[PDB]
Scaffold this active site. Structure first.
Site, PDB file in Angstrom:
ATOM      1  N   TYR A  23      38.728  50.475  42.467  1.00 56.08           N
ATOM      2  CA  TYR A  23      39.263  49.331  41.738  1.00 56.08           C
ATOM      3  C   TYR A  23      40.772  49.568  41.794  1.00 56.08           C
ATOM      4  O   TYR A  23      41.504  48.819  42.431  1.00 56.08           O
ATOM      5  CB  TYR A  23      38.779  49.298  40.282  1.00 56.08           C
ATOM      6  CG  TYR A  23      39.293  48.072  39.559  1.00 56.08           C
ATOM      7  CD1 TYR A  23      38.887  46.793  39.943  1.00 56.08           C
ATOM      8  CD2 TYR A  23      40.267  48.180  38.562  1.00 56.08           C
ATOM      9  CE1 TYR A  23      39.446  45.655  39.365  1.00 56.08           C
ATOM     10  CE2 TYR A  23      40.833  47.043  37.977  1.00 56.08           C
ATOM     11  CZ  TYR A  23      40.423  45.788  38.388  1.00 56.08           C
ATOM     12  OH  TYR A  23      41.031  44.664  37.875  1.00 56.08           O
ATOM     13  N   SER A  63      37.010  42.472  43.509  1.00 50.35           N
ATOM     14  CA  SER A  63      38.253  41.909  42.983  1.00 50.35           C
ATOM     15  C   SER A  63      39.472  42.738  43.385  1.00 50.35           C
ATOM     16  O   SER A  63      39.850  42.757  44.548  1.00 50.35           O
ATOM     17  CB  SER A  63      38.195  41.786  41.455  1.00 50.35           C
ATOM     18  OG  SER A  63      39.081  40.707  41.076  1.00 50.35           O
ATOM     19  N   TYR A  64      40.096  43.415  42.428  1.00 53.69           N
ATOM     20  CA  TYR A  64      41.252  44.217  42.768  1.00 53.69           C
ATOM     21  C   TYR A  64      40.746  45.334  43.656  1.00 53.69           C
ATOM     22  O   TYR A  64      41.454  45.806  44.551  1.00 53.69           O
ATOM     23  CB  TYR A  64      41.908  44.789  41.514  1.00 53.69           C
ATOM     24  CG  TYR A  64      43.329  45.246  41.751  1.00 53.69           C
ATOM     25  CD1 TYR A  64      43.601  46.327  42.587  1.00 53.69           C
ATOM     26  CD2 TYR A  64      44.406  44.593  41.144  1.00 53.69           C
ATOM     27  CE1 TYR A  64      44.908  46.752  42.816  1.00 53.69           C
ATOM     28  CE2 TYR A  64      45.714  45.010  41.369  1.00 53.69           C
ATOM     29  CZ  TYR A  64      45.953  46.090  42.205  1.00 53.69           C
ATOM     30  OH  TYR A  64      47.234  46.513  42.438  1.00 53.69           O
ATOM     31  N   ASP A 117      34.475  30.692  43.205  1.00 52.82           N
ATOM     32  CA  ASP A 117      35.214  31.676  42.414  1.00 52.82           C
ATOM     33  C   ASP A 117      36.474  30.952  41.925  1.00 52.82           C
ATOM     34  O   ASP A 117      37.335  30.555  42.732  1.00 52.82           O
ATOM     35  CB  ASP A 117      35.607  32.885  43.275  1.00 52.82           C
ATOM     36  CG  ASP A 117      36.180  34.040  42.453  1.00 52.82           C
ATOM     37  OD1 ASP A 117      36.895  33.767  41.462  1.00 52.82           O
ATOM     38  OD2 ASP A 117      35.929  35.222  42.807  1.00 52.82           O
ATOM     39  N   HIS A 162      33.282  34.198  40.297  1.00 56.41           N
ATOM     40  CA  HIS A 162      33.764  35.551  40.517  1.00 56.41           C
ATOM     41  C   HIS A 162      32.728  36.641  40.256  1.00 56.41           C
ATOM     42  O   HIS A 162      32.710  37.663  40.940  1.00 56.41           O
ATOM     43  CB  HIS A 162      34.999  35.819  39.662  1.00 56.41           C
ATOM     44  CG  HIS A 162      35.694  37.093  40.010  1.00 56.41           C
ATOM     45  ND1 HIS A 162      36.318  37.291  41.222  1.00 56.41           N
ATOM     46  CD2 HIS A 162      35.843  38.244  39.315  1.00 56.41           C
ATOM     47  CE1 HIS A 162      36.822  38.512  41.260  1.00 56.41           C
ATOM     48  NE2 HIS A 162      36.548  39.109  40.114  1.00 56.41           N
TER      49      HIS A 162
HETATM   50  P1  LIG Z   1      40.009  40.960  39.730  1.00 51.56           P
HETATM   51  O1  LIG Z   1      39.997  42.337  39.808  1.00 51.56           O
HETATM   52  O2  LIG Z   1      39.385  40.293  38.375  1.00 51.56           O
HETATM   53  C1  LIG Z   1      38.868  41.160  37.376  1.00 51.56           C
HETATM   54  C2  LIG Z   1      39.516  40.801  36.031  1.00 51.56           C
HETATM   55  C3  LIG Z   1      37.340  41.038  37.336  1.00 51.56           C
HETATM   56  O3  LIG Z   1      41.471  40.237  39.871  1.00 51.56           O
HETATM   57  C4  LIG Z   1      42.643  41.029  40.044  1.00 51.56           C
HETATM   58  C5  LIG Z   1      43.834  40.112  40.222  1.00 51.56           C
HETATM   59  C6  LIG Z   1      42.837  41.911  38.799  1.00 51.56           C
END
Ligand SMILES: *P(=O)(OC(C)C)OC(C)C
Ligand SMILES: *[C@@H]1O[C@H](CO)[C@@H](O[C@@H]2O[C@H](CO)[C@@H](O[C@@H]3O[C@H](CO)[C@@H](O)[C@H](O)[C@@H]3O)[C@H](O)[C@H]2NC(C)=O)[C@H](O)[C@H]1NC(C)=O
Ligand SMILES: *[C@@H]1O[C@H](CO)[C@@H](O[C@@H]2O[C@H](CO)[C@@H](O[C@@H]3O[C@H](CO)[C@@H](O)[C@H](O)[C@@H]3O)[C@H](O)[C@H]2NC(C)=O)[C@H](O)[C@H]1NC(C)=O
Ligand SMILES: *[C@@H]1O[C@H](CO)[C@@H](O[C@H]2O[C@H](CO)[C@@H](O[C@H]3O[C@H](CO)[C@@H](O)[C@H](O)[C@@H]3O)[C@H](O)[C@H]2NC(C)=O)[C@H](O)[C@H]1NC(C)=O
Ligand SMILES: *[C@@H]1O[C@H](CO[C@@H]2O[C@@H](C)[C@@H](O)[C@@H](O)[C@@H]2O)[C@@H](O[C@H]2O[C@H](CO)[C@@H](O)[C@H](O)[C@H]2NC(C)=O)[C@H](O)[C@H]1NC(C)=O
Ligand SMILES: *[C@H]1O[C@H](CO[C@@H]2O[C@@H](C)[C@@H](O)[C@@H](O)[C@@H]2O)[C@@H](O[C@@H]2O[C@H](CO)[C@@H](O)[C@H](O)[C@H]2NC(C)=O)[C@H](O)[C@H]1NC(C)=O
Ligand SMILES: *[C@@H]1O[C@H](CO)[C@@H](O[C@@H]2O[C@H](CO)[C@@H](O)[C@H](O)[C@H]2NC(C)=O)[C@H](O)[C@H]1NC(C)=O
Ligand SMILES: *[C@@H]1O[C@H](CO)[C@@H](O[C@@H]2O[C@H](CO)[C@@H](O)[C@H](O)[C@H]2NC(C)=O)[C@H](O)[C@H]1NC(C)=O
Ligand SMILES: *[C@@H]1O[C@H](CO)[C@@H](O[C@@H]2O[C@H](CO)[C@@H](O)[C@H](O)[C@H]2NC(C)=O)[C@H](O)[C@H]1NC(C)=O
Ligand SMILES: *[C@H]1O[C@H](CO)[C@@H](O[C@@H]2O[C@H](CO)[C@@H](O)[C@H](O)[C@H]2NC(C)=O)[C@H](O)[C@H]1NC(C)=O
Ligand SMILES: *[C@H]1O[C@H](CO)[C@@H](O[C@H]2O[C@H](CO)[C@@H](O)[C@H](O)[C@H]2NC(C)=O)[C@H](O)[C@H]1NC(C)=O
Ligand SMILES: *[C@@H]1O[C@H](CO[C@@H]2O[C@@H](C)[C@@H](O)[C@@H](O)[C@@H]2O)[C@@H](O)[C@H](O)[C@H]1NC(C)=O
Ligand SMILES: *[C@@H]1O[C@H](CO)[C@@H](O)[C@H](O)[C@H]1NC(C)=O
Ligand SMILES: *P(=O)(OC(C)C)OC(C)C
EC number: 3.4.14.5
Lengths: 728, 726
Positions: B509, B592-593, B670, B702
């Site tokens: 992550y 995601s990230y 998403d 998402h």
């Molecule tokens: P993703 O990792 O969304 C998570 C909040 C589930 O989006 C990035 C930009 C943090």
């Protein structure tokens, strides 16, 4: 030594086919575009003589995407800033160049972002569409005249067809027809006020921060269709009134009674225009022949010159009502209509006599009418050797229909069995286009004795390269099923050993009136598959296919996603019977209609195919356009044929997909067969929990033809197939 | 030896972690929604009583997904016709059940498609938002008072947040705050007029002939953000003959100079309210302490009484400025702020004194303040044993900062190293929630003497089941990258033998202030990958990690897609050199990230990884929302950080994917990380000539958490992972 035809060979276009694009400017000469320079030729002797050269347009800046010379040969339209839209439609910039003073006209230029420009058929008048409105230029440099003021984006179309009319009806963008002389200008108007909009995202380059939403008026099965109107204005009155009035040509009553289409408009004489209409229930069709009433200044259509054409076992024509070919005096014409035995042939119509007179044989059909002179009528058909997958040029004598002569059959029966043709202005000369089974061969001829003048292109170069590579072979034969023959095609690997058991890839399309089995010579993915991967790529034209009579073509009437699908499976069974097929390695793939069938088959639970690939497929007939769908399916209403619409989806077969390896692909920007269609497929598979392979192509349309995209899919597709067959 | 934890087990959820969600209604009792009915418990003894058989509505005619009792205990708000929108937002129909008469209220009921509803804090009042406007009911059966009349879909939001305020600043849909005794109703208003709209297709059910185009006002990096306003309305002085008067609280002046945000609102007393504003350049923050003026009817936010919170190394707060905890008389407050040395600790303030005093210090961080009384300040930090991946409930004496006591550390050190807590109204009792390293454990305690009253749920049921299966283990350790130590964790297969070599999957992550290495007990995909496939699933917290001071966290400031990604390669590079790792079979995946870092790593040319899976990743920062992105990247302008924005995109690394097996997965619907992100990654890879695996999920958001899509995505991923390893 002697390598094979490799995937890169295909993708890199190493072994290219030479063409010979002509363009008859007169009846004795034609223009030949040689990239750099564009010279003119003398059909008679073959004289070179440059008409316009490379430098003649340098120091210009904007690369000239295309050209178009006026009939009178004094001006030349320069098409630059080309911006493709749909199949034939495209926006672009235009500049006219004066050839009588070698000067580029700079006054009253044509608007940038113009949708369509048309030279008058005689002289140098211009007609163009800008912002969905028609404009007319009497002189290339003088200001133009506005013809319509109702033009409105995505709502009202004047001089240009909408999406559906472009792809399915007129198979063209231009919705205007200059009278032979240039006096009248006829045009159709399309009202899409009530037509639903297909919407999909378009991402563009990374630079675009926010995706764009493309929305196009697109009527799906049974949805609200655009409406249409026809007008005819006299351009000679433009310099006398300020606002010439466009006369409207309405009816027929049998058409105005309900949803209908305008399917054909062709001028017959200086004051006679023919118009064909069609009900949304494409089983009925009406042709009006209207004359200009010099007294009333109105156009009249006598009921005594109205010709009806209905079909009982299907729809009218192959994809639309046949096309009228009027004789000089415009008092009679030729049309291709199916005879009583269900075979498409040519018959002579007298404008005021309702019954036509057939002039051609039986078991075989005429593909199209190519030219009509006082002497003979030239047409192309598949009569030769009884093979429906072939094509030749015949000449029939107007004074004695018993006298028919084939002009291409024997030119080279070995290398040439599939012909195309292009006659000069008055049909004094014609160019023949042989496309198979050997390498393309372009030749020029004179109509007098049909004596061959010379070979314009023989692809000798290519022939020399291919003898150095292990090229595959192609067998074109048939198989008899239920007391009737159906032709198949097979691209056989080098050194085909009928004793060995090869893996087979069934290349399929199977749409109504389609033909995948012919004599055309090709250099495609199948070439590589057979040459290098040793895979047999076979195609079969089962029920539903065309060019073999209505009895076969109309088999899938109101029944899409059945026989056409079933026959495809049986073709495989019939192929394995031949004994050189490995039953454990039988694949199938198709594009669009092919994807549809490929998918319906993979979900049949037959157990004949191991894997398959569907590219830009159709999932349910309610997602495709009205004109095409309804033509074969009728209406998605419980009163008509809704029941079959719901029984012919691919989603309803989702559960059976657990028995095969599936590969789904589709372009996200496909205006034709929407991404939505594959979107519903994947979703259904996920619901019944079936694992499959997927691939989407950002911003690619139905062609997924962009250079990189094209190379990327066939590469991906290949890994899939090799993996499914256990290669390399 | 027994069977393993299969993929089905995880997907079918055959092994469930028992919970114990309670809701304190006072300082002595709490509610516990059992199977059908709802009960009330007396924390003192443990005895309980029923509150409603739930069957009370067997013939309500509708399915109920939620029951909200008035703090009064006199009314019940029944929620039905639930239609989810985003993470927190959703619409529903409502009905009120009068308990005093055991009957459903029929007159003047709440509108259908209501966007939000909330009881007053003390009695049984109601403030609900309908059609983006606010309404207030003084009594469940009386007519509603229209508070605002400016609501407008996708343009003005009264009492509710817009997409970005919902996801990035308030982590909620509610934009209204009652005063302690419910006299005043504070609310914010968002104007999204000039805010651009993200638009994507939703295909819905097979039956829908034409796809619908979903469109929502979403500000991406550098676009026009929504503006906001704050108001406070008196609910004790409103008539049905006159429109309500909502007093507006403006400023700060230091905030109106440019774009800003309303990031926090917390009442201090019945007439004092605090507001925290944050500049668009989340470097500067200001907290106002506005007081109500009787003989004026206005709210005054005295300057000098405002406190500034700024940073020179990064943004303010972990994700946003911390929440204040005001004392009884609301004259001073406690709130977590960053140290001089960058570590977050509790600082004691005075609404008039500019500087505060740290009451906690050291090289560890206070995760959050849980409860405050006159006696103590209860908080949670990762001080114990000095491991940042742990959490314990500590309490510090407010009269002697030297007298701090851990209340959870020693309860069960083997089983419990990660705690959560829930105090009662006056913090008389508290429920400790242990989430690892062992099975969750729920217990009750009395603050008077920190006595352990009784066990609520020890998960004895689940324990017995697990010992019948070969479960993997978890190693929480660290490695030292030039001076500094960074923690990692490793999900190890059953009967792990360091003498053998195993394929490794790098679960990643690595976004700002994240923590993939902790003591929490999880029953996820990795469990199966290690238990059934004997695959080591490793995670590592490198530069950018959180809960370890700012030197670590602000390390990737203005520079996303650098150290956190590079440190992932380094961590993995050292993992291979550990001896039990097959350097030939090392993979990486993220969501995601996590997807972005996965994609950046795969396209770095390291050669360390064989294959990787990217789920709903970020491809280029200009595609993500403002609040979040700009927090670490600033604005995408050449005057600012536009250069890095251009340097940190996935596509630019396209040519490097020729050496790895990549799998791109993404949901078409998403709304958070737009499908556009992956549509650009796929296009770039097609332009460079890189073949890869793809999988889209039509209409999935998402989360890709729908029942079917979920079982499907993890099945596609497993085939890919074991195909890459075998
Ligand atoms: P993703 O990792 O969304 C998570 C909040 C589930 O989006 C990035 C930009 C943090
Ligand atoms: C294209 O087709 C549309 C129909 O889809 C035509 O629009 C219709 O136009 C009529 C007038 O010609 C409108 O009716 C009139 O409306 C006004 C005010 O609303 C009223 O005062 C009149 O008494 C009369 O009812 C009608 O609203 C409108 N309908 C729709 C659906 O748009 C349009 O005229 C056609 N365009 C062309 C160039 O033919
Ligand atoms: C050239 O002549 C044509 C046809 O006479 C003109 O088009 C017509 O122009 C009128 C006026 O703009 C259009 O609007 C009409 O307005 C009246 C009054 O509001 C209303 O009752 C009608 O229903 C109509 O909406 C009319 O639709 C339009 N008709 C067509 C077929 O286009 C054109 O404007 C003239 N050009 C010039 C330069 O004068
Ligand atoms: C929400 O925010 C809007 C601005 O973002 C408020 O509005 C204001 O801003 C507009 C510009 O968007 C101003 O201009 C409008 O009118 C002029 C005509 O003079 C037009 O030329 C221009 O294009 C705009 O349409 C407005 O004057 C200004 N006030 C209003 C009432 O529009 C909007 O009011 C605000 N809404 C709320 C509830 O706060
Ligand atoms: C739980 O029972 C409470 C009474 O408990 C009894 O008395 C204790 C002192 C102790 O000896 C215990 O073993 C006994 O069972 C009861 O608490 C009191 O407060 C409530 C307030 O609602 C009141 O209604 C009740 O009458 C009181 N009981 C006594 C004995 O004074 C409480 O009501 C009950 N709670 C629940 C949720 O059932
Ligand atoms: C909220 O709406 C529901 C659903 O009905 C919708 O709205 C109606 C006006 C009509 O347009 C329907 O087609 C819509 O589906 C309301 O349901 C009520 O249901 C009862 C019977 O169950 C019926 O007698 C009522 O007429 C329906 N509508 C109303 C206004 O009572 C529901 O009541 C609505 N809630 C509120 C507070 O208005
Ligand atoms: C309360 O304020 C609202 C909002 O202005 C008033 O409602 C408007 O009244 C005017 C005049 O009748 C209408 O033209 C508007 O359409 C109404 N709605 C809006 C949104 O403006 C309402 O009348 C006021 N009520 C009282 C008692 O003052
Ligand atoms: C809630 O707090 C408010 C604010 O302190 C209280 O309202 C004030 O009450 C005093 C007398 O008790 C009045 O003189 C003020 O004018 C009131 N202020 C306002 C704005 O109305 C209120 O009493 C408290 N509510 C309860 C139930 O105790
Ligand atoms: C918050 O960040 C901003 C910039 O993102 C800092 O403001 C200045 O920004 C310029 C760029 O225009 C830099 O060159 C300067 O170094 C920044 N500082 C100064 C004093 O000019 C701002 O300083 C940061 N906030 C804090 C409290 O440090
Ligand atoms: C060709 O165009 C028309 C086609 O009929 C020819 O005829 C003229 O048509 C207009 C119709 O508006 C009549 O008003 C004229 O009286 C017709 N002229 C004649 C001589 O019949 C026209 O002659 C031809 N024009 C050209 C330039 O060849
Ligand atoms: C052409 O097809 C249409 C399809 O609608 C047929 O029209 C309908 O009405 C007929 C009687 O006039 C019925 O016999 C048809 O069954 C009915 N069609 C449908 C689909 O319900 C029409 O008959 C056909 N006409 C010809 C000449 O074939
Ligand atoms: C081609 O040449 C024509 C002249 O014809 C010449 O004489 C006849 C008898 C033959 O011998 C022929 O080969 C000679 O060329 C010109 O009239 C004609 O314009 C020329 N064509 C072009 C395009 O320049
Ligand atoms: C066409 O558009 C180009 C680009 O804006 C402009 O330079 C040129 O002047 C335009 N010409 C006309 C005739 O509008
Ligand atoms: P596809 O096969 O599209 C091609 C005609 C391009 O769609 C079906 C409905 C014919």
């Amino acid at each position: 030594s002697r390598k094979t035809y490799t995937l890169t060979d295909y993708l890199k276009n190493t072994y290219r086919l030479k063409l010979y694009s002509l363009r008859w400017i007169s009846d004795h000469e034609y223009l030949y575009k040689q990239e750099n320079n564009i010279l003119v030729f003398n059909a008679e002797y073959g004289n070179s003589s440059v008409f316009l050269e490379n430098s003649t347009f340098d120091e210009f800046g904007h690369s000239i995407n295309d050209y178009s010379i006026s009939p009178d040969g004094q001006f030349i339209l320069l098409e630059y800033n080309y911006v493709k839209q749909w199949r034939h439609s495209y926006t672009a910039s235009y500049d006219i160049y004066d050839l009588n003073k070698r000067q580029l006209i700079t006054e009253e230029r044509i608007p940038n972002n113009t949708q369509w420009v048309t030279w008058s058929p005689v002289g140098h008048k211009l007609a163009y569409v800008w912002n969905n409105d028609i404009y007319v230029k009497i002189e290339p440099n003088l200001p133009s005249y506005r013809i319509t003021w109702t033009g409105k984006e995505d709502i009202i179309y004047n001089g240009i067809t909408d999406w559906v009319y472009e792809e399915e009806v007129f198979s063209a963008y231009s919705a205007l027809w200059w009278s032979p002389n240039g006096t009248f200008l006829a045009y159709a108007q399309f009202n899409d006020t009530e037509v639903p909009l297909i919407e999909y995202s378009f991402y563009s380059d990374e630079s675009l921060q926010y995706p764009k939403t493309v929305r196009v008026p697109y009527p799906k099965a049974g949805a609200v269709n655009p409406t249409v109107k026809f007008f005819v204005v006299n351009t000679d009155s433009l310099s006398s009134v300020t606002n010439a009035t466009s006369i409207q040509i309405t009816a027929p009553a049998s058409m105005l009674i309900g949803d209908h289409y305008l399917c054909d408009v062709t001028w017959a004489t200086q004051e006679r225009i023919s118009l064909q209409w069609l009900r949304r229930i494409q089983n009925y069709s009406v042709m009006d022949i209207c004359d200009y009433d010099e007294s009333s200044g109105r156009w009249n259509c006598l009921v005594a010159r109205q010709h009806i054409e209905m079909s009982t076992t299907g729809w009218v024509g192959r994809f639309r009502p046949s096309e009228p070919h009027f004789t000089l005096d415009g008092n009679s014409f030729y049309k291709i209509i199916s005879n009583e035995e269900g075979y498409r042939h040519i018959c002579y119509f007298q404008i005021d006599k309702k019954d036509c007179t057939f002039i051609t044989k039986g078991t075989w059909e005429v593909i199209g009418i190519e030219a009509l002179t006082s002497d003979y009528l030239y047409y192309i058909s598949n009569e030769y050797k009884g093979m429906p997958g072939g094509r030749n040029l015949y000449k029939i004598q107007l004074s004695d229909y018993t006298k028919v002569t084939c002009l291409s059959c024997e030119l080279n029966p070995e290398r040439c069995q599939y012909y195309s043709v292009s006659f000069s202005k008055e049909a004094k000369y014609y160019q023949l286009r042989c496309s198979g089974p050997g390498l393309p061969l372009y030749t020029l001829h004179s109509s007098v004795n049909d004596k061959g003048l010379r070979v314009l292109e023989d692809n000798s170069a290519l022939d020399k390269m291919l003898q150095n590579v292990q090229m595959p072979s192609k067998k074109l034969d048939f198989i008899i099923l239920n007391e009737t023959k159906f032709w198949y095609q097979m691209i056989l690997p080098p050194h085909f050993d009928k004793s060995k058991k090869y893996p087979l890839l069934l290349d399929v399309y199977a749409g109504p009136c389609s033909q995948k089995a012919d004599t055309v010579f090709r250099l495609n993915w199948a070439t590589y598959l057979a040459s290098t991967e040793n895979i047999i790529v076979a195609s079969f034209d089962g029920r539903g296919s065309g060019y073999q009579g209505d009895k076969i073509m109309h088999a899938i009437n109101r029944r899409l996603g059945t026989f056409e699908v079933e026959d495809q499976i049986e073709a495989a069974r019939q192929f394995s019977k031949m004994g050189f097929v490995d039953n454990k390695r039988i694949a199938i793939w198709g594009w669009s209609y092919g994807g549809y069938v490929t998918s319906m088959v993979l979900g049949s639970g037959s157990g004949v195919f191991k894997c398959g690939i569907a590219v830009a497929p159709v999932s349910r007939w309610e997602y495709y356009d009205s004109v095409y769908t309804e033509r074969y399916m009728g209406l998605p209403t419980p009163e008509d044929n809704l029941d079959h619409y719901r029984n012919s989806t691919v989603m309803s077969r989702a559960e059976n997909f657990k028995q095969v390896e599936y590969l789904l692909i589709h372009g996200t920007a496909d205006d034709n067969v929407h991404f939505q269609q594959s979107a519903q497929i994947s979703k259904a598979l996920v619901d019944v929990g079936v694992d499959f392979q997927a691939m989407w192509y950002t911003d690619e349309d139905h062609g997924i033809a962009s250079s990189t995209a094209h190379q990327h899919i066939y590469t991906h597709m290949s890994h899939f197939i090799k993996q499914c067959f256990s290669l390399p």
